[PDB]
Amino acid sequence: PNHPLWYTLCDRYGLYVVDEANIETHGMVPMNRLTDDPRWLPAMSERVTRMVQRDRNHPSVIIWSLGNESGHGANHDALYRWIKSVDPSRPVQYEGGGADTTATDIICPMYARVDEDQPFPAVPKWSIKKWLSLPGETRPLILCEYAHAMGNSLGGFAKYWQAFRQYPRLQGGFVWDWVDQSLIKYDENGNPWSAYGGDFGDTPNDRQFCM
Amino acid sequence: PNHPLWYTLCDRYGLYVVDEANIETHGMVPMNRLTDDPRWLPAMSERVTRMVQRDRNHPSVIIWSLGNESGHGANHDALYRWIKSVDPSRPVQYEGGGADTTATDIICPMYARVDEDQPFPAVPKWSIKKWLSLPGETRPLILCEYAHAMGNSLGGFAKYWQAFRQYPRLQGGFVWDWVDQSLIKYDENGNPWSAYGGDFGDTPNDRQFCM
Ligand code: NA
Ligand code: NA
Ligand code: NA
Ligand code: NA
């Protein structure tokens, strides 16, 4: 959840907001080790419930999200239903565990390609066009993340937009991402330069991947 | 409906058969002028009902077809339901009126393209990939006719097969078609040659379009 003023500005300037619980357990092995554990349900529940209680009156918030990259655990299903029960006014989405689980109203993959399948075991990323028409699938598809804009990037962006416009159930996505996470450091003369992972003696680190 | 031996041969050699009623009213304006007329239901009903009564024991017949290019009329809906009631063992398909009407269990367009939409009014031919995922659509798609093999043709054939293999619900199609409808004439020397429309003083005619 963001700084409270963010929602007020989005209400007033006009932007649709996906408000997202502060839950990410990416580093766990496997990713849902905590989120499938009933011992972590209380802690997870507070990150979802207290977000809803705070932000539910904002018109800019149109979709609730259960967090990011925490696999798919039984705790997600429980909290999905909790939101559906207390706030029927907003769809709930969640990407973890293959982007189309029972804890999401919207197929919301990250970095699924337009035409090319990436058939990873258990959590494949289908071509977005193909994904829509998988047997039994009826939901809209909106990428929670696509077109990773790292450095000299955004090649193939037009291919996404051509597809979004042609397919009714392809309703767009959220680019990753808005602003480089570089930090300012100073040289011996006090001149500022843009720093990234590893520049603060921080180790281990993932270098320029924050930008 | 074919010569009865065809079905015996398809049974024994192993070919899947779409058995199709002898109804085509292509030349009407609009195409459903007679098929939507209850006055023509009796004539229509015999062409469907007597086909089903003859061929229903042939294993090679896997799908029934209500005919060809006769628009979509109320008579189709009645006869669709007649077959479903008497023979639940086979899906019923029919292309007329836009290939996805209430008279067909299978989206069965003719000459719909792989990627390109052809948005004709009333009866659009959507890209086959797009068609599958239109809001509320769940049926399988199998083209009753595609890859018009007229003369030096079948360009872009590989594109259909790439799509058929990638998309579960694209389950193939029927090439148009098997054999040139040319007829043998003889010259002044008694030597045989291949003839098409117009070569018999027949007029009006559509020339080589029978090949
Ligand atoms: Na769209
Ligand atoms: Na990053
Ligand atoms: Na297929
Ligand atoms: Na022809």
Curated annotation (Swiss-Prot), chains A, B:
The chain holds residues 394 to 604 of 1024 of the full protein. This is Beta-galactosidase. Changing E69H: Slowly inactivates galactosidase activity by reducing the binding of magnesium. It increases binding specificity. Changing H148 to E/F/N: Poorly reactive with galactosyl substrates. Less stable to heat than wild-type. The active site is at E69, E145. Signal peptide: none annotated. Mg(2+) 2 binds at N205. Substrate binds at E69, E145, Y146, A147, H148. The gene is lacZ.
